[PDB]
Design a protein around this ligand. Structure first.
Ligand SMILES: *[C@@H]1O[C@H](CO)[C@@H](O[C@@H]2O[C@H](CO)[C@@H](O[C@@H]3O[C@H](CO)[C@@H](O)[C@H](O[C@@H]4O[C@H](CO)[C@@H](O)[C@H](O)[C@@H]4O)[C@@H]3O)[C@H](O)[C@H]2NC(C)=O)[C@H](O)[C@H]1NC(C)=O
Ligand SMILES: *[C@@H]1O[C@H](CO)[C@@H](O[C@@H]2O[C@H](CO)[C@@H](O[C@H]3O[C@H](CO)[C@@H](O)[C@H](O)[C@@H]3O)[C@H](O)[C@H]2NC(C)=O)[C@H](O)[C@H]1NC(C)=O
Ligand SMILES: *[C@@H]1O[C@H](CO)[C@@H](O[C@@H]2O[C@H](CO)[C@@H](O)[C@H](O)[C@H]2NC(C)=O)[C@H](O)[C@H]1NC(C)=O
Ligand code: TZV
Ligand code: NAG
Ligand code: NAG
Ligand code: ZN
Ligand code: ZN
Length: 817
């Protein structure tokens, strides 16, 4: 008499009412809403609904017959039969997958929570029980590094292609292509134009190898790519409630095996939506995090009902993080340029500049002009104009013609526009900043038979996930920017065992040739002890060679993977090197600074000794460089480093150990070898060094072919000289500072690809100590060893006893401080 249970919408006499008219009269039963109305709007059972008379308008049922008719709400068993929800069960390991026929290869589901920054789980884990249990029972990283720019379409498409945006063509949510003379927008018909989307998304990879795919939203999944759609896909519609998306995927997993997909996707707009609207630290973001946690729980409860919770490989992921924007942390360019109307500026933290008159002036326009106009205009300026090829190589943001030739690099929390009118609310949450900023780091949790249990992996990049998903589905990956095997440590049973790459040609021989001691035009410091008998000093016993090889190449010599190359090994007492006769320059030197080594202050300028192992060339003579305004030279292995004396190491002054070097770059190079290298050596109990030139004239992150290098030589004093685009450095010590670089159990690495520029305008030098700015520039231009490998065509560490996959893990690491 006091409850609507069983009598929804039936007229009553005397009892509280359960008809629509009761509301206005205020004589409804206490439970009228929960019993009769709520079921039309919710996907959950509760203590009011358990044993309900079936309602015709209810989204799912909590009636006694719901199991038989198979339309129970997902939480029915937990709430109405007192069984445990997935999250309530303790972790148990999934060694053998428990799958139906059709799933001999188990399915993989890629579940994106847009704008879920890694920090949300660090801080709010206690409010997020389901995601917290997936972490506890699964494979987790505190930080997954997204691609630059840290935006939705770029990162989602990178996750399913393993490609940098510069290569997959989706470089932002808004772009212009000058060859197509079209603009890309998420609100335009151009979003569906196949021409934008390059590479091979995993659902295409899967199709070619006999697996069907089912996407409930993913950037690109509603587009015909290489003539292919997913076998099941949805036209984007953000209004579709999360519950309906999850329920649909659970229907696809019940398809008969002939039509049932193996690869699934799920995309939710939260907590990105709430992040923008209310900021990453807000009541709205907390409620949004609890909601997506509940939705993940709904999937797991759903998989459990289907007995697929020990079958399906789930990758819970996000595209990027979220930062608090501020109207006080917004740069407007009109302050420096005036209210000009000939330029269009892409606003945000990944701001870019382009002429209005396109495609006509797209290449011809004076980018360099505005670049110089906007450099070092204030002290502690919060932005930096960069021609795209001068951006740090770690950002891999230049190759595409869709990347405007002038870009801006913004400090954390800072954004940029032309003027206040051409942006949105400045106080909103935002993302797009440098992919190494803490608040831009993303979520990754892997749970299922394929994944290890209770593992916390070191930080990895989302471009590695394509290969991982391919391994989980026994697919052969399309060519991508991931290092295949670098994530084998996440997998119970790795399917791909990587091998170190084999070098194409063997080392050529550079033998001693008797030739006349020639004048090089050098005014050598009298301090330096010249090389009196070369043939004597460099005819080494195999006993003596083995001592040097062990001290300078403790990890093995760099191997050269280039097609056409003639490299030869040069021994010296303190360093080894690979010399290119084809470019008259070493491709790499290797030496080791010990904790108790000496660095000389004695001048060694305009001093060189002839190396009788290679033909003498005009560009190897002090005379070529004497009062030369266009280029100078520098040494790879540092002459300042003496082990046997307290003077200058004479063997380092050989013509074979010099590289063309702009006078402005010498400031950086000197500071590194005089100050920093000594400090590193002390702090780490020694440091092995490998340094060399880099030639990336195509600014594509790859070493240029020898064919291409011929046409890139400059003419200076009627000599053909090849000037490096960058210089690389790779420092290697031990994790354990009790050990020296020659006897490490575990390698601690730190690599740089320093840009080789005619000025130091990048660093805004004037009125600041030399000390500060050089370390700041090194930090900004750090790189993975894998980045160095791709851009030099070298391969390091091939003599380490570690398995290959462990070395790939080490080479793909990027140091964060
Ligand atoms: C990330 O991974 C990417 C995929 O592996 C990789 O990009 C590939 O780069 C190579 C070389 O730049 C591209 O391969 C072709 O190589 C020749 C060079 O001789 C190009 O000329 C050729 O272009 C073409 O032009 C022809 C016109 O006559 C035509 O017949 C061809 O069909 C073709 O259009 C190729 O471009 C390859 O396409 C790239 N793939 C993609 C998807 O971008 C990146 O280098 C790698 N990034 C890093 C930093 O490692
Ligand atoms: C995008 O997804 C939206 C949410 O799924 C969807 O909106 C919803 O569309 C349904 C259509 O059934 C509306 O229901 C209306 O139509 C039925 C059919 O007879 C009648 O009961 C009523 O006239 C009812 O108003 C929902 O009201 C509506 N839901 C919401 C929250 O707006 C869109 O249709 C989807 N598609 C596109 C392309 O926009
Ligand atoms: C490149 O695209 C631009 C912009 O769409 C084109 O410019 C337009 O030209 C038409 C022809 O009279 C006019 O509608 C307008 O002057 C422009 N339209 C807009 C929307 O700005 C241009 O024709 C295209 N082609 C080339 C190669 O320049
Ligand atoms: C079906 O393929 C897709 C998947 C996602 C798409 C998308 O995802 C987004 C949604 C909303 C915001 N804006 S937000 N999260 O602030 O409200 C951004 C990206 C935008 C446009 N098309 C898509 C097609
Ligand atoms: C920068 O260019 C603007 C025009 O866009 C000009 O008015 C201004 O004087 C320039 N500022 C310099 C050169 O510092
Ligand atoms: C030329 O080089 C010498 C030292 O070799 C240097 O002291 C001098 O400044 C330079 N001369 C000119 C013309 O700049
Ligand atoms: Zn996003
Ligand atoms: Zn966003």
């Amino acid at each position: 008499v006091k409850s609507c249970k069983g009598r929804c919408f039936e007229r009553t006499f005397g009892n509280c009412r359960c008809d629509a008219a009761c509301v206005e009269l205020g004589n409804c039963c206490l439970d009228y809403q929960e019993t009769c109305i709520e079921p039309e709007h919710i996907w959950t059972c509760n203590k009011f609904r358990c044993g309900e008379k079936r309602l015709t308008r209810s989204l799912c049922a909590c009636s006694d017959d719901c199991k038989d008719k198979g339309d129970c709400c997902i939480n029915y068993s937990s709430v109405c039969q007192g069984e445990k929800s997935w999250v309530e069960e303790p972790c148990e390991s999934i060694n053998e997958p428990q799958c139906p026929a059709g799933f001999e290869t188990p399915p993989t589901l890629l579940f994106s929570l847009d704008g879920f920054r890694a920090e949300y789980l660090h801080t709010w884990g206690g409010l997020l029980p389901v995601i917290s249990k997936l972490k506890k029972c699964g494979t987790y990283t505190k930080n997954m590094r997204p691609v630059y720019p840290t935006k939705t379409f770029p990162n989602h498409y990178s996750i399913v292609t393993g490609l940098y945006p510069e290569s997959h063509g989706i470089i932002d949510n808004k772009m212009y292509d000058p060859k197509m003379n079209a603009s890309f927008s998420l609100k335009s018909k151009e979003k569906f134009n196949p021409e934008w989307y390059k590479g091979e998304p995993i659902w295409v990879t899967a199709k070619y190898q006999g697996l069907k795919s089912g996407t409930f939203f993913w950037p690109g999944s509603d587009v015909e790519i290489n003539g292919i759609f997913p076998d099941i896909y949805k036209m984007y519609n953000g209004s579709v409630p999360f519950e309906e998306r999850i329920l649909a995927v659970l229907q696809w997993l019940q398809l008969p095996k002939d039509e049932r997909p193996h690869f699934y996707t799920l995309y939710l707009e939260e907590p990105d939506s709430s992040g923008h609207s209310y900021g990453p630290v807000s009541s709205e973001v907390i409620k949004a995090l609890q909601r997506v946690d509940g939705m993940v729980g709904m999937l797991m409860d759903g998989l459990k009902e289907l007995n697929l919770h020990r079958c399906l490989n789930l990758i819970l992921i996000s595209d990027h993080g979220m930062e608090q924007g501020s109207c006080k942390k917004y740069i407007y360019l009109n302050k420096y340029l005036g209210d000009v109307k000939n330029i269009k500026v892409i606003y945000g933290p990944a701001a870019r500049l382009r002429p209005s008159d396109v495609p006509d002036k797209y290449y011809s326009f004076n980018y360099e002009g505005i670049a110089r106009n906007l450099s070092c205009r204030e002290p502690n300026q919060h932005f930096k104009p960069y021609l795209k090829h001068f951006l740090p190589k770690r950002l891999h943001f230049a190759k595409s013609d869709r990347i405007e030739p002038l870009t801006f690099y913004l400090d954390p929390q800072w954004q940029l526009a032309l003027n206040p009118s051409e942006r949105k609310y400045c106080g909103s949450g935002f993302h797009g900043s440098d992919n190494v900023f803490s608040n831009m780091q993303a979520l990754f949790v892997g749970y299922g038979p394929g994944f290890k249990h209770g593992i916390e992996a070191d930080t990895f990049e989302n471009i590695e996930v394509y290969n991982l998903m391919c391994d989980l589905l026994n697919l052969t990956p399309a060519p991508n920017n991931g290092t295949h095997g670098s994530l084998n440590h996440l997998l119970k049973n790795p399917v791909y065992t990587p091998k170190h790459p084999k070098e194409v040609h063997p080392l050529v021989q550079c033998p001693f040739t008797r030739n006349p001691r020639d004048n090089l035009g050098c005014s050598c410091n009298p301090s330096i002890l010249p090389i009196e008998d070369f043939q004597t000093q460099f005819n080494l016993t195999v006993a003596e060679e083995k001592i040097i090889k062990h001290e300078t190449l403790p990890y093995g010599r760099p191997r050269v993977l280039q097609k056409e190359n003639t490299i030869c090994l040069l021994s010296q007492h303190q360093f080894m090197s690979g010399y290119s006769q084809d470019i008259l320059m070493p491709l790499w030197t290797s030496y080791t600074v010990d904790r108790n080594d000496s660095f000389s202050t004695e001048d060694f300028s305009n001093c060189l000794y002839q190396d009788f192992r290679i033909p003498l060339s005009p560009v190897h003579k002090c005379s070529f460089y004497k009062n030369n305004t266009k280029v100078s030279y520098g040494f790879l292995s540092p002459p300042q480093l003496n082990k046997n004396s307290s003077g200058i190491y004479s063997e380092a002054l050989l013509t074979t150990n010099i590289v063309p070097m702009y006078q402005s770059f010498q400031v950086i190079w000197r500071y590194f070898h005089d100050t920093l290298l000594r400090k590193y050596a002390e702090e780490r109990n020694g440091v092995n060094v490998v340094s060399g030139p880099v030639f990336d004239f195509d600014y594509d992150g790859r070493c240029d072919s020898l064919e291409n290098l011929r046409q890139k030589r400059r003419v200076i004093r009627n000599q053909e000289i090849l000037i490096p685009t960058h210089f690389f450095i790779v420092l290697t010590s031990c994790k354990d500072t009790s050990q020296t670089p020659l006897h490490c159990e575990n390698l601690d690495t730190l690599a740089f690809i320093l840009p080789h520029r005619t000025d130091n305008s990048e660093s805004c030098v004037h009125g600041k100590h030399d000390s500060s700015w050089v370390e700041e520039l090194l930090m900004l231009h750090r790189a993975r060893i894998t980045d160095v490998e791709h851009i030099t065509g070298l391969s390091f560490y091939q003599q380490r006893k570690e398995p290959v996959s462990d070395i790939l893990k080490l080479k793909t690491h990027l140091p964060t401080f």
